[PDB]
Amino acid sequence: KARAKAKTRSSRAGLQFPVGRVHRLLRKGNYAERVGAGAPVYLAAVLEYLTAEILELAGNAARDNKKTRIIPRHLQLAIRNDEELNKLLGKVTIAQGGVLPNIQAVLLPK
């Protein structure tokens, strides 16, 4: 026999990051023994807010330097432009980025 229409749990919460894949990365990562049904929902949302907030800021730096695609320099520069995004990734190197443009305003020429 057949069964009902399989509605994915990512579409039942209005998210884009999956909840089926997150819920088997809380029971095969030995984080705890029981994982609630609402926990990979709530975690796939916080993975989805923070994935926007970089790419929101990574979209602007691509636009301000006339680019269609976002190369890692923009991800390097979207981070450390925002203050609170930088304090999350304060220890973290991003590959192929270089640094922000910075002079200490004492080395200016005389």
Partner 1 sequence: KVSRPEGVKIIPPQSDRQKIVLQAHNLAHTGREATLLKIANLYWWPNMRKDVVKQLGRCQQCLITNASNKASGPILRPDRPQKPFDKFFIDYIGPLPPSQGYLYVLVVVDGMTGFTWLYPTKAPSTSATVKSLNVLTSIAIPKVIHSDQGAAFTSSTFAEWAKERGIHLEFSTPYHPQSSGKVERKNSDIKRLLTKLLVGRPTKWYDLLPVVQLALNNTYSPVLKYTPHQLLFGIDSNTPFANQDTLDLTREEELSLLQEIRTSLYHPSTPPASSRSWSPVVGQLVQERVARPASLRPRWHKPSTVLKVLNPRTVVILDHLGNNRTVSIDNLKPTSHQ
Partner 2 sequence: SRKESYSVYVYKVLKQVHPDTGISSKAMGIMNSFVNDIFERIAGEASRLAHYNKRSTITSREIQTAVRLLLPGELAKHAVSEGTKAVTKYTSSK
Partner DNA sequence: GTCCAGGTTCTCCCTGTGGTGAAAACCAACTAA
Partner DNA sequence: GCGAAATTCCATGACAGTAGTTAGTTGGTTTTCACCACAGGGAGAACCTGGAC
Partner DNA sequence: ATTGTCATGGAATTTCGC
* Structural tokens at position 69: 């695609």
Q: Closest separation between CB of residue 44 and partner 2, Å?
A: 8
Contacts of 104 (CB under 8 A, 6+ apart): none
Size of the site for partner 1 (CB under 8 A): 4
Distance CA 56, CA 52 (A): 6
Question: If contact means CB under 5 to 8 A according to the sort of partner, which of partner 1, partner 2, DNA, none does residue 93 touch?
Answer: none
- N-to-C CA span, the chain: 85
Question: If contact means CB under 5 to 8 A according to the sort of partner, which of DNA, partner 1, partner 2, none does residue 66 touch?
Answer: DNA
Site string for partner 2, 40-69 (x = CB under 8 A): -xxxxxxxxxxxxxxxx-xx--xx----xx
Q: Select from 57, 51, 49, 48 the least CA-distant residue to 75.
A: 57
Q: Which residues of the shown chain bind DNA in the complex (CB under 7 A)? A: 1-11, 18-21, 23-24, 34, 36-38, 66-69, 71, 109
